Amino acid sequence: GDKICLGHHAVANGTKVNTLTERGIEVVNATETVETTNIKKICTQGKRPTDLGQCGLLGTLIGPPQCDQFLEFSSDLIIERREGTDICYPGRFTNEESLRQILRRSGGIGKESMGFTYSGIRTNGATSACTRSGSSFYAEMKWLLSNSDNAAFPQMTKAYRNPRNKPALIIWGVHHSESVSEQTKLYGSGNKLITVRSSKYQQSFTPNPGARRIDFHWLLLDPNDTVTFTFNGAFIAPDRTSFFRGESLGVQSDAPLDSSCRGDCFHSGGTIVSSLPFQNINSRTVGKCPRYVKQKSLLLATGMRNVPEK
Amino acid sequence: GDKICLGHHAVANGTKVNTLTERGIEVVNATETVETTNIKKICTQGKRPTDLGQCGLLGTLIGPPQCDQFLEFSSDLIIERREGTDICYPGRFTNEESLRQILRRSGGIGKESMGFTYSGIRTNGATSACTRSGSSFYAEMKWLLSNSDNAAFPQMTKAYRNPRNKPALIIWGVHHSESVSEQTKLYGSGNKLITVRSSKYQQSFTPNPGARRIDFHWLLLDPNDTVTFTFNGAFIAPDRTSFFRGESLGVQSDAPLDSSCRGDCFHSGGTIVSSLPFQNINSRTVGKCPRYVKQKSLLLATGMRNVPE
Amino acid sequence: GDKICLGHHAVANGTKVNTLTERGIEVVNATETVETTNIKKICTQGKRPTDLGQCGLLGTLIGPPQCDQFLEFSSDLIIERREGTDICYPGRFTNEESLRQILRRSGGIGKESMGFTYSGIRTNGATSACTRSGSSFYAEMKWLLSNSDNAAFPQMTKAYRNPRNKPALIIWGVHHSESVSEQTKLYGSGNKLITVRSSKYQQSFTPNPGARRIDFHWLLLDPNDTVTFTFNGAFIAPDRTSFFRGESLGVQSDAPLDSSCRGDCFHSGGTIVSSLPFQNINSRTVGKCPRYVKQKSLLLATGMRNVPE
Amino acid sequence: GLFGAIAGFIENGWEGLINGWYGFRHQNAQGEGTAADYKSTQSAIDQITGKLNRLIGKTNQQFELIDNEFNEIEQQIGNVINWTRDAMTEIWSYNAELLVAMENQHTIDLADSEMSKLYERVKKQLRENAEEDGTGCFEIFHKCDDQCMESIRNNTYDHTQYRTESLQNRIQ
Amino acid sequence: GLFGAIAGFIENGWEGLINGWYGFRHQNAQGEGTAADYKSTQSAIDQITGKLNRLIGKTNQQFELIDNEFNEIEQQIGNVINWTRDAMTEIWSYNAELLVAMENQHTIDLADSEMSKLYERVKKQLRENAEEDGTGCFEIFHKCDDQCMESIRNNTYDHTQYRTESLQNRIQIDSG
Amino acid sequence: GLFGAIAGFIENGWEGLINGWYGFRHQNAQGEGTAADYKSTQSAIDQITGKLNRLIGKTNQQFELIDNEFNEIEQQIGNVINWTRDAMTEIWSYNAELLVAMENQHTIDLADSEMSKLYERVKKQLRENAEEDGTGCFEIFHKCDDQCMESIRNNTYDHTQYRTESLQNRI
Ligand SMILES: CC(=O)N[C@H]1[C@H](O[C@@H]2[C@@H](O)[C@H](O)O[C@H](CO)[C@@H]2O)O[C@H](CO[C@]2(C(=O)O)C[C@H](O)[C@@H](NC(C)=O)[C@H]([C@H](O)[C@H](O)CO)O2)[C@@H](O)[C@H]1O[C@@H]1O[C@H](CO)[C@H](O)[C@H](O)[C@H]1O
Ligand SMILES: *[C@@H]1O[C@H](CO)[C@@H](O)[C@H](O)[C@H]1NC(C)=O
Ligand SMILES: *[C@@H]1O[C@H](CO)[C@@H](O)[C@H](O)[C@H]1NC(C)=O
Ligand SMILES: *[C@@H]1O[C@H](CO)[C@@H](O)[C@H](O)[C@H]1NC(C)=O
Ligand SMILES: *[C@@H]1O[C@H](CO)[C@@H](O)[C@H](O)[C@H]1NC(C)=O
Ligand SMILES: *[C@@H]1O[C@H](CO)[C@@H](O)[C@H](O)[C@H]1NC(C)=O
Ligand SMILES: *[C@@H]1O[C@H](CO)[C@@H](O)[C@H](O)[C@H]1NC(C)=O
């Protein structure tokens, strides 16, 4: 007689997914949840990028010849390159990595004079390591030494009050001479000490002669607080200080910039553009990113169990 | 004809919740899982609290004037305050936060005399920076000088063995003079050196004159082990050592103490009292706390789907 | 009347488990997911183990008597023991833990001569603190001093370029004398200065008389790069440098080795051998381990609800 | 729900059922009446109570201070702590939202289940004496007074007593 | 599936059904016809879309670099960072694996449930006019033409209209 | 159980059923007989085995020593390590408890589902030849011998053969 039958759809070949009780069960339709497609470029559309190139991120503060174009910059996406260098004269920043992390999210920097004027000493200390218009020095810094060879450097005090609405990034250097004789030539004989003090900071520095270097040190000065420098030689003085602009991201990559694609997740290999919750491209990312997973593929079922016709 | 119908209950106004397949589905009843009610006090009922006030935690070991009332405290809940300072004379502790963390869970400290006696030198070193009744010094520390101006400080050795069943906290200080001629005035002439030695610690110190300061260094001495001090000047000697009492929890807060409420979860803004599994009050907590989540509310359904008439 | 009844199986004595809805519900069968059975041994089957024993891991680089048999070794599993020490003469390594962590995964070390030769000085400097058959010194190092008491040590430069495919671990020491007069006796009077320089490393060292210690310092030298030593005394020179073999796992334990059991998860009290997803043995493990949980037991139902007759 | 009773073939709930979660509404010559079923209601409440016993009143583990509000710790350690704590926040936020969503999905299906169980109990209880109309009601093909309606709710209904009468009515 | 319809008592799916997820296949004196059911199809699609709305296109969490890929940081803190990241990787990989497996289980059962619901709905419509054959079909015991088949699909079938014919075909004995 | 068969309308399980997980028990003129069903039993066992394949024999990631048991490291760093480790313990203890509880909930409902599917299978098989007892039994309204009981078990029972006899018994 007459009859009515109830049923459901199917396809010839569905997609295999995993469940709590079964591996490789076939469903009508599925979708990927793990992103594996990478864009081998830095996507900078709708952003204000800064490609540092030759210049080191920490170099923007002290100003070696390679960072002349970045002494003041405004950015929301800072790109660091492998060839970047912070220094010209031998030496290093103490707490360098934590300072890089602050500068990466700063939004860029603005410079302001600290207003130090000097008397009875020389200010024009230069080096052929930092060559800018023939034998110069760090652009934001001043190399202080005696008026003539072997003369005694006077016990000096310089104070700076932060007049602004935000924290000031204060930078200073300690010069470690090639020898005891050279330290004597530049600053006069005897032991040297550099003391830096604020309401939250307190440190003393002694030069260690033997191999030519300038080591840089830093602090963040609160609004209306005063930083005090006491020194009798081997002191690299700040001429300017830095103030942060707003908000940014910092990326370490050798990938070319592209102004034709929009991205919010960045890594060394380029840009991840996805609406998916997970990614398998890179464990080290910056920005708004899917969580890193070790799996290549995790298919989510978007349909019923596939049961093809016999 | 006659009939019997089966059905369920409903309310006029249900509660919206979220599921795996739906957002804002209406149910009969729901219960909140995220704690949002904060108590703006440190709930100290049942506890033995210590409000450190003007005294800094590390100051309790050396004894500047601000900490004279905390040389031997006993608590299970240590509260640090914003206005607390560890020192009077300029200087600092090496590994200061490591020492703070050890002290916060110490249960408080008991002090014990190390028993050092001296001859041929002064022991009465005092400074105007630490006024107690005129010029004085750290309560648990001795400032050692030469007998007179520019006199030679003799090479000295002092030893202390730990007679207790628990580790002893040893503190000592290195005095850095204002100038080179200052160092020669208080102590002898020439290079000064301080060596501190135990069975698993050895370190030498040299003072760097030019800026007036005293820096403090420390070690933990095991039972039946000995600390040896060898020095010839610029040395701030310990008079008493510290032994820990038991267990405690350390809190940093601006909230007032209240002995009328009980709590075990603390933060800068007070106490979280809750049986709920999550909280949105503060991501930085101490003690036994519900886990912090970003969400303001997460309603758990405690009823069927609400289908009104 | 004829009838056919449908039903399921059951046992008289079932196993109680937990669900989202109920605590202690009885099911037919269940299996444990949390490992609690520990093996009080370090399982070394299928591996190449090195039990350092009395030798401290850092000692393998400089060579005190305790580490003579481990100057060169090859391993995929390095076991540190409580009784291990790095030095014979008093002194320490700079950034010691960082160096330990690099050596734990090194796969062992191979040694190579740096080809330093000397003239106008003595190279046979020794101490009773390091005995082998009488007074000896660090096997990989050379204690350089003047030809006779109070003689002038000549200003020397010694350079070495890494000729290998992988980085070289360069070690050197600074000798701090017991007194100024001892420093004069061994090296001659005057300021002593040691500088160490590669393309990525630059540091100068001055001795600090009064201590009696040899402090060791280190750097990683890239392929085809050169390290330069400039010194005029108080310098403990390397004779050999190290190169890493491959991959290994570092373990800290007091448990004896066992070549008859196999495992990949190690801890202080032995080896966890399991296929289960969780373990309640030790929160501090190394290698490939089940994840640590604080529950002693979590039973997974492998059968239906049990309803006995 | 997965069982298609609550918000399914049963149109809507009853706002006048305050004595329980599930119940019976009868219609005969004596007028209508409503009564709650204890067994199905209690089974549902116990299961929700079980979820609450799991989530509420947990014993949490102790954590201590690792940074400092008054005196800032070294910058590199501080950045590692902040990176860790915020990553912990994201995991727990994820876990909490998933747990609630998952439990809510189960709770709704759970209550829908108990309604279906009760409906099926009555179906097997009435045998050949009743037909289901499709809305959740059973059409009784015999005279069933208040005491007879009682016997269905009480689970003491004897289908043999009314079988002949109801089979006569179902056929013609 | 938990409900025993899809991959259960219903042999297989229909590949010819392209206009929906669930459908009817009738057979009468006029021939065979196939039609999709809207209510059951959309109810399944909406619940799947609900899952997609929870997982796809959501506000990702914020990330910053604590490492240095150009010049290596200190070993001790670097090993702590690496240890912590790998621990997060293990947690998130577990979360991802479990989430998908749990959702896939619920999805399959969800679809199976809707097939069961539609089956039971038709069963109640037909009352005493039809019997289940055990394969997902209903043997109708009265002449049901194309209009009658349509009234079952759009829920306007009145069982009273055909009851007398049906009971005469179902009960093929003498009643005394 | 969500499906209401096991610990539901079926009073209790059978301890004598060692043959399988689900089975049939019949009463007729020749006595009682119990036999297990292969299809349902295998379906339930296969799914529980599936859960075990997910949890047991996993490959885990390698973790190195970041601490020092013999030479105590800087307490500031050590306390961060101890904080992180204790936080990982908290997360995994949560995950483990939830995973097992969720799986146990699903296992019990899964097994209950299989009982129901078998019950429904037999119902549609018997057509108008039997009536439901309410306890998990079917009252057969025709004389059904051991051969007839076997035909129901292995799905070869023809209801048309017994329909006439059954209907007049039901009136
Ligand atoms: C052979 C020669 O002329 N050497 C001079 C050297 O030049 C270096 C090059 O050989 C090398 O290839 O590149 C490096 C760059 O890293 C040098 O350019 O430079 C010596 C140092 O110098 C200055 C400098 O840094 O450029 C000159 C500068 O005015 C001065 N600034 C001051 C004083 O504010 C600095 C400063 O004194 C030091 O940097 C402080 O540490 O130095 C230069 O001295 C060269 O000289 C040789 O020096 C030795 C003594 O060591 C003898 O005096 C030789 O007679 C002299 O040739
Ligand atoms: C199936 O899912 C895919 C994504 O995986 C999507 O592109 C498509 O719209 C879906 N539907 C069909 C009928 O393929
Ligand atoms: C609904 O739940 C709340 C808890 O949020 C409780 O206070 C209240 O008693 C409950 N109401 C009913 C009617 O069960
Ligand atoms: C059930 O599981 C237990 C424990 O895992 C095992 O020993 C046993 O072989 C299994 N089967 C039975 C019938 O107990
Ligand atoms: C980490 O976060 C805390 C609280 O938001 C903040 O006070 C501190 O400045 C942060 N630390 C660093 C190193 O940026
Ligand atoms: C951490 O791991 C990365 C690779 O993911 C490696 O490049 C780096 O050397 C590791 N860091 C340390 C300090 O071992
Ligand atoms: C961390 O915990 C271990 C025990 O698990 C303990 O021995 C160690 O002292 C702790 N570290 C610190 C810095 O307190």
- Please state the φ and ψ torsions of residue A144, each to the nearest 5 degrees: -95, 130
Q: Whose CA is nearest to atom 11 of ligand 7?
A: F78
Least CB-CB distance to F120: which of E4, E86, E101? E4
As a dihedral over the C-alpha atoms of residue A181, residue A182, residue A185, residue A188, rounded to 10 degrees, the angle is: -70
Kindly report the CATH class assigned to C1-47+256-309.
Answer: mainly beta
Which of B177, B161, B159, B158 minimizes the C-alpha distance to B119?
A: B158
Give the whole-angstrom CA distance, residue A29 versus residue E137. Answer: 26
The span from the CA of A289 to the CA of A291, in Å, is 6
Ligand 4 atom closest to C30 (CA): 2
Q: Which of B234, B179, B228 is nearest to B205 (CA)?
A: B234
Which contiguous run of DSSP H or E holds residue B136?
strand B135-136
Distance CA B123, CA B144 (A): 5
What CA–CA distance (Å, rounded) separates A7 from E16? 11
Give the H or E element holding residue A195: strand A194-197
Q: Which fold would CATH assign to domain A1-47+256-310? A: Hemagglutinin; Chain A, domain 2 (2.10.77)
Task: Specify whether the backbone of A164 is left (phi greater than 0), alpha (psi in -120 to 50) or beta.
Answer: beta
Span between the terminal Cα atoms of chain A, in Å: 25
* Rounded alpha-carbon distances, angstroms, from residue F157 to A252, F148, F161: 74, 7, 9
- Name the closest ligand to CA A87: 1
Cβ–Cβ < 8 Å for A88, A138: yes
Closest to E33 (Cα-Cα) out of E152, E146, E164, E174: E146
Say if residues C66 and C55 touch (Cβ distance below 8 Å): yes
- Sheet containing strand C226-231, edge to edge, reads C156-161, C226-231, C194-197, C202-205
How far lies B165's CA from each of A162, B106, B243, D170, in Å?
53, 15, 10, 93
Helices E75-126 & F75-126 angle (0-180, nearest 10): 20
Structure tokens at B303: 């009823």
Per-residue b or e along D117-150, where b marks 16 or more CB atoms closer than 10 Å to that residue's CB: bbbbbbbebbbebbbbebebbbbbbbebeeebbb
Please give the distance of CA F56 from its chain centroid, rounded to a whole number: 20
Ligand nearest to the CA of A301: 2
Helix (H) or strand (E) holding F147: helix F146-153
**Burial level of A165, CB count in 10 A (0-12/13-18/19+)?**
exposed
Which of B93, B90, B52 is closest to B71 using CA atoms?
A: B52
Q: F75-126 and F146-153 are packed helices; what angle lies between their axes, rounded to 10 degrees? A: 140
Cα–Cα distance, C250 to C262 (Å, whole number): 17
Look up tokens 């060791």; give the residue. C216
Rounded Cα–Cα distance for residues F96 and C278 (Å): 8
Q: How far is CA E41 from the centre of its chain?
A: 8
Q: Which of A62, A186, A53, A179 is nearest to A130 (CA)?
A: A62
Whether residue F51 contacts residue A20, with contact meaning beta carbons closer than 8 Å, is answered with: yes
Backbone angles phi and psi of F23, in degrees to 5: -155, 180
**For E2, which DSSP code?**
T
Nearest by Cα to A49 from A251, A246, A267: A251
CA-CA distance, E8 to E1, in Å (whole number)? 7
> Cα(A216)–Cα(A238) distance, rounded to whole angstroms?
11
- Cβ contact C11:C287 at 8 Å: no
Q: Where do runs of H (alpha helix) occur along A51-188? A: 59-62, 96-104, 180-187
Identity of the residue numbered F7 = A
Distance CA D138, CA D25 (A): 10
CA distance D106 to C55: 60
**A184 ligand 1 Cβ < 6 A:** no
Helix (H, G, I), strand (E, B), or coil: what is residue D153? helix
- Residue carrying structure tokens 């050279």: A182
- Spatial distance between the Cα atoms of B297 and D93, rounded to a whole number of angstroms: 11
Phi/psi-derived region of residue B271, left when phi > 0, alpha when psi is between -120 and 50, beta in every other case: beta
Interface of B with C in 182-221 (CB under 8 A): 191, 193, 195, 202, 204, 206
Distance CA B225, CA B202 (A): 13
Burial class (CB in 10 A: 0-12, 13-18, 19+), B247: exposed
Q: Is B4 helix (H, G, I), strand (E, B) or coil?
A: strand
H or E element that contains B60: helix B59-62
Contact criterion met (CB below 8 Å) for C159 and C227: yes
Distance A5 CA to ligand 2 centre (A): 28
CA–CA dist B118, B153 (Å, integer): 12
Interchain pair E83, F102: CB under 8 A: no
Q: How far apart are CA A98 and CA A100, in angstroms?
A: 5
Question: How many angstroms separate the Cα of B282 from the Cα of each of B249, D69, E59?
Answer: 18, 14, 22
Contact C62, C216 (CB under 8 A): yes
Q: Where are the alpha helices (DSSP H) in chain D?
A: 38-55, 75-126, 146-153, 163-171
Residue of D nearest to A199 (CA): D71
Instruction: Name which of A64, A222, A58 is nearest A129 in CA terms.
Output: A64
- Using a 6 Å cutoff on CB, does residue A29 contact ligand 2? yes
Radius of gyration of chain B (CA): 30
Q: Which two tokens stand for residue E108?
A: 């399959």
Strand B257-258 and strand B278-279: pairing?
unpaired
Strand partners, B249: B77
Q: What is the DSSP string of F65-117?
A: --S-SSS---HHHHHHHHHHHHHHHHHHHHHHHHHHHHHHHHHHHHHHHHHHH
Rounded to whole angstroms, the Cα distance separating A192 from A183 reads: 9
Look up residue A5 and give its amino acid.
C
Residues whose CB is less than 8 angstroms from the CB of residue D4 and which lie 6 or more positions away in sequence, other chains included? D112, D116, E113, E116, E117, E120
CB pairs under 8 A between C and E: 14
User: Which residues neighbour B178 within 8 Å (Cβ) at sequence distance 6 or greater?
Assistant: B209, B210, B211, B212
Return the ∠ at Cα D115 (arms to D112 and D119), rounded to 5°: 140
Is C22 touching D (CB cutoff 8 A)?
A: yes
Handedness of CA C65, C66, C69, C70 (dihedral sign): negative
Paired with D95 in beta bridges are none
Q: How far is it, in rounded angstroms, from Cα E165 to Cα E128? A: 11
Contact predicate C214/C93, CB 8 Å: no
Q: Does A295 touch chain F (CB under 8 A)?
A: no
Write down how long chain E is: 176
List the resolution, Å: 2.6
Contacts 24+ apart (CB under 8 A), B220-224: B220/B167, B220/B168, B220/B169, B220/B170, B221/B160, B221/B162, B221/B167, B221/B168, B221/B169, B221/B170, B222/B162, B222/B167, B222/B198, B223/B162, B223/B164, B223/B165, B223/B166, B223/B167, B224/B161, B224/B162, B224/B163
Residue F111 CB neighbours (<10 A): 29
Write out the DSSP string of A143-165: E-B-SSTTPPPPPEEEEEE--SS
The CA–CA distances, whole Å, from D13 to B10, D113, D123 equal 5, 15, 20
Of D57, D102, D143, the CB nearest to B2: D143
CA neighbor of E88 nearest in space, from B293, F87, F34: F87
Interaxial angle between packed helices D146-153 and D75-126, expressed in degrees from 0 to 180 and rounded to the nearest 10:
130
What tokens does A156 get? 């000096």
Please give the DSSP secondary-structure letter assigned to residue B39: B
How far apart CA A173 and CA A142 sit, in angstroms, is 9
Six-digit token string for C253: 């334990």
CA of A250 to the centre of ligand 6 (A): 20
Q: What SS3 state is found at A245?
A: coil
Please give the distance of CA C188 from its chain centroid, rounded to a whole number.
Answer: 38
Crossing angle of helices D75-126 and E75-126, in 10° steps, is: 20
Query: Is residue A177 in contact with ligand 1, taking CB distance under 6 Å?
Result: yes
Say if residues C81 and C254 touch (Cβ distance below 8 Å): yes
Chain F residues touching B95 at Cβ < 8 A: 74-76
C84 Cβ contact partners less than 8 Å away, ≥ 6 residues apart:
C52, C53, C54, C55, C56, C57, C59, C66, F70
Distances (CA, A) of B152 to B145, B237, C173, C276, D66: 9, 18, 33, 71, 46
The CA F115 to ligand 4 mean position distance, Å, reads 21
Yes or no: is domain C48-255 CATH 3.90.209.20? yes
DSSP C57-92: TTHHHH--GGGGGGSSEE-SEEEE-TT-BS-SSS--
Q: What is the C-alpha separation between E63 and A67, in angstroms, rounded?
A: 27
C13 CB-near residues (< 8 Å, 6+ apart): C308
- What phi, psi does F145 have (nearest 5°)? -80, 180
Contact C262, C41 (CB under 8 A): no
| Residue A88 burial class via C-beta count within 10 angstroms: exposed 0-12, middle 13-18, buried 19 and up | buried
B29: three-class secondary structure by DSSP:
coil
Does residue E82 have its Cβ closer than 6 Å to ligand 6?
yes
Separation of alpha carbons F134 and D120, rounded Å = 9
Phi and psi (nearest 5°) for E47?
Answer: -70, -35
Which helix (H) or strand (E) segment holds residue F149: the answer is helix F146-153
| Residue numbers after which chain E breaks, C to N beyond 2.5 angstroms | none
Q: Which two tokens stand for residue A147?
A: 């008026």
Minimum distance, in Å, between the CA of residue F33 and any CA atom of chain A: 33
Could you tell me which residues are beta bridge partners of residue E61? Answer: A289
Query: Domains in chain D, start-ordered, CATH in brackets?
Result: 1-172 (3.90.20.10)
CA distances to A202, B154, D105, F151 from B236, rounded to whole Å, are 20, 15, 69, 101
Identity of the residue numbered C20: L
DSSP state of B132: S
Q: Is D75–A99 a contact, with Cβ atoms under 8 angstroms apart?
A: yes
Other Cβ atoms closer than 10 A to C82: 10
Helices (H), E36-139: 38-55, 75-126
* Nearest-by-Cβ selection for A286 from E28, E64, E144: E64
CA C106 to chain centre: 9
Contact present, B102 and F78 (Cβ < 8 Å): no
CA distance B14 to B2: 33
CA B148 to chain centre: 40
Query: Backbone phi, then psi, for F83, in 5-degree steps?
Result: -70, -50
The DSSP secondary-structure symbol of B43 reads: E
Tell the burial category of F158 from Cβ atoms under 10 Å away from its Cβ (0-12, 13-18, 19+).
exposed
* Domain assignments of chain C as residue spans, ordered by start: 1-47+256-309, 48-255
* Token pair of A135 as six digits: 């034998």
